[PDB]
Design an enzyme around this catalytic site. Structure first.
Site, PDB file in Angstrom:
ATOM      1  N   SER A   1     -11.941  10.517  -4.104  1.00  7.24           N
ATOM      2  CA  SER A   1     -11.489  10.156  -2.746  1.00  7.24           C
ATOM      3  C   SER A   1      -9.953  10.090  -2.748  1.00  7.24           C
ATOM      4  O   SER A   1      -9.355  10.138  -3.783  1.00  7.24           O
ATOM      5  CB  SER A   1     -12.095   8.887  -2.253  1.00  7.24           C
TER       6      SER A   1
ATOM      7  N   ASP B   1      -6.524   8.081  -0.594  1.00  6.79           N
ATOM      8  CA  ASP B   1      -6.037   7.051   0.356  1.00  6.79           C
ATOM      9  C   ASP B   1      -4.865   7.637   1.141  1.00  6.79           C
ATOM     10  O   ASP B   1      -3.972   8.310   0.559  1.00  6.79           O
ATOM     11  CB  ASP B   1      -5.573   5.799  -0.378  1.00  6.79           C
TER      12      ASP B   1
ATOM     13  N   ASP C   1     -12.269   8.576  -8.399  1.00  9.52           N
ATOM     14  CA  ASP C   1     -13.603   9.070  -7.993  1.00  9.52           C
ATOM     15  C   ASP C   1     -13.489  10.337  -7.135  1.00  9.52           C
ATOM     16  O   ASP C   1     -14.576  10.852  -6.722  1.00  9.52           O
ATOM     17  CB  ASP C   1     -14.363   7.979  -7.244  1.00  9.52           C
TER      18      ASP C   1
ATOM     19  N   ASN D   1      -7.778   8.783  -5.708  1.00 12.26           N
ATOM     20  CA  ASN D   1      -8.551   7.794  -6.493  1.00 12.26           C
ATOM     21  C   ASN D   1      -9.285   8.523  -7.612  1.00 12.26           C
ATOM     22  O   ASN D   1      -9.534   9.728  -7.482  1.00 12.26           O
ATOM     23  CB  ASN D   1      -9.492   7.032  -5.582  1.00 12.26           C
TER      24      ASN D   1
ATOM     25  N   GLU E   1       0.842  -1.209   0.000  1.00 11.43           N
ATOM     26  CA  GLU E   1       0.000   0.000   0.000  1.00 11.43           C
ATOM     27  C   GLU E   1       0.872   1.252   0.000  1.00 11.43           C
ATOM     28  O   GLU E   1       0.556   2.222  -0.721  1.00 11.43           O
ATOM     29  CB  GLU E   1      -0.927  -0.053   1.222  1.00 11.43           C
TER      30      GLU E   1
ATOM     31  N   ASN F   1      -9.053   4.993   2.935  1.00 12.17           N
ATOM     32  CA  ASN F   1      -9.777   5.795   1.908  1.00 12.17           C
ATOM     33  C   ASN F   1     -10.762   6.785   2.551  1.00 12.17           C
ATOM     34  O   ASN F   1     -11.546   6.371   3.413  1.00 12.17           O
ATOM     35  CB  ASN F   1     -10.541   4.855   0.992  1.00 12.17           C
TER      36      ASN F   1
END
Ligand SMILES: [Cl-]
Ligand SMILES: [Cl-]
Ligand SMILES: [Cl-]
Ligand SMILES: [Cl-]
Ligand SMILES: [Cl-]
Ligand SMILES: [Cl-]
Ligand SMILES: [Cl-]
Ligand code: NA
Length: 129
Positions: free
Chosen positions: A50, A52, A48, A46, A35, A59
């Protein structure tokens, strides 16, 4: 902060993640490797909108508040910036809620794609824990 492998394993054990929800420490170390490459300050946007955050790439769509993810929740009741600390307490506490949410560590797509089923004990091999 960029952790070393055994340094992170130790910190995750100190915060109660080892065998949490049945996931051995090597699972957690493997998830963090893929990660964030063990970097607490890692952030990734992301598609969309969002973002992380942190060592476990938590998220903003569900788990933390960053003020720029419309229609999102904050189920860990923390600013997403808390997930970027050198101290992993906030990331661990939040990860415990995520892994309890019903799909276990599959919530971490990198864990499903790169760690699940593999020899995850290699990640803690040699560590004084
Ligand atoms: Cl490594
Ligand atoms: Cl393990
Ligand atoms: Cl928001
Ligand atoms: Cl919420
Ligand atoms: Cl906040
Ligand atoms: Cl820590
Ligand atoms: Cl499970
Ligand atoms: Na949010």
């Amino acid at each position: 902060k960029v952790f070393g492998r055994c340094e992170l394993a130790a910190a995750m054990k100190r915060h109660g993640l080892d065998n949490y929800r049945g996931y051995s420490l090597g699972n957690w170390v493997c998830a963090a490797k893929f990660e964030s490459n063990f970097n607490t300050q890692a952030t990734n946007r992301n598609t969309d909108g969002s973002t992380d955050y942190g060592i476990l790439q938590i998220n903003s769509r569900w788990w933390c508040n960053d003020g720029r993810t419309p229609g999102s929740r904050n189920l860990c009741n923390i600013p997403c910036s808390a997930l970027l600390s050198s101290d992993i307490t906030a990331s661990v506490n939040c990860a415990k809620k995520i892994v309890s949410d019903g799909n276990g560590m599959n919530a971490w797509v990198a864990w499903r794609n790169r760690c699940k089923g593999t020899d995850v004990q290699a990640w803690i091999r040699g560590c004084r824990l």
